[PDB]
Amino acid sequence: GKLHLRFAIAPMRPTPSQTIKEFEPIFKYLADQLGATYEIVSPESWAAISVAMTNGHVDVGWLGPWGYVLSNKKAGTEVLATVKYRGEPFYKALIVGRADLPIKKWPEDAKGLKLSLSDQGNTSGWLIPMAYFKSIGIDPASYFEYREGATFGQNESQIQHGLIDLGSDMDRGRNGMIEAGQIDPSKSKIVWESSKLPNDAISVPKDFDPALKARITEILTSLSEEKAQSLMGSGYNGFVKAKHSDYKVIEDAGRILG
C-alpha cells in the first residue's frame, strides 16, 4: 500500500509547462511529507480544473476562487487553505489596456473597443469584470468588440502586440510576467483594478479522508514564507487555513450574475 495522490494546479503561469515547472516542488514536498507517489496536471483554462475536481479526477487541487465556488456548489468540494501571495491571502483583478489607449472617461469612451475576457471559470478574468460591467449597466458582448475564453497569457501578449485594446488579468500573474521578461510594461497600463479578492483555494473532494485532510492542512499552513517561496513561483509564499465563508464575496458575485 503506497499512498498515491492526483494533483492539479490552475494556470498560475502563461503555459502549463511553466506552471508545472515553477509549482510542482510544493506538490512534491507535500507528497514527500506523506510518503506518497503523485501525478500532476495543469489544465489550460480555469474552468477545466474546476470541472476536473467536480468530476472526481483530483485529490488535491489548487483552484481559482470561482473554480472552487462552482465545484463546492456542484460536488461539495472542500477548501482546506488559501494561498498567500506576498504574504497575503488576497489579490486583485485587472483590466489592462494598450499604453496609448485614451481612458480619461473609462468605460464610457470605450464603446466598440476590442475587449478580451477569459474563460467563464476564471474569477479575475471573467466573473469579476462581468460583475463590474453589470453594476454599471454595461453588457460587454454588445458594448465592446467582445471575445471570451482567452488565457491571461494570450490577453497580455495581444495587448502588447496591439491586437486587442483591453484584456483581463490578475495582478499576481501580471507581476510574474513582468518579472520573467514576458511583458514589457511600458506597452500596457492598468485601466481598472478590483477590490481585494480571496486568493486560490487548495481544495479536496467532499469525501476526502479526514485524517489526510488534517495532515495536508497542517503541512501547508506550517510552512515558513522562506520555505514556501523556495517551492513555488515568485511571490507565492505560503498558505493559511480557510473555510467556505472566506469565499463569500465570490459566491455573491456569481449569484448576482445568475
Curated annotation (Swiss-Prot):
CDD domains associated with the record: PBP2_PhnD_like (cd01071)
Positions in coiled-coil regions: none
Keyword Transport assigned: yes
GO cellular component: ATP-binding cassette (ABC) transporter complex
Keyword vocabulary terms for this entry: Signal, Transport
Gene Ontology biological-process entries: transmembrane transport
Known role: Probably forms part of a binding-protein-dependent hypophosphite transporter.
Protein family membership: Belongs to the phosphate/phosphite/phosphonate binding protein family.
Protein name as annotated: Probable phosphite transport system-binding protein HtxB
Organism: Stutzerimonas stutzeri
Name of the gene this protein is made from: htxB
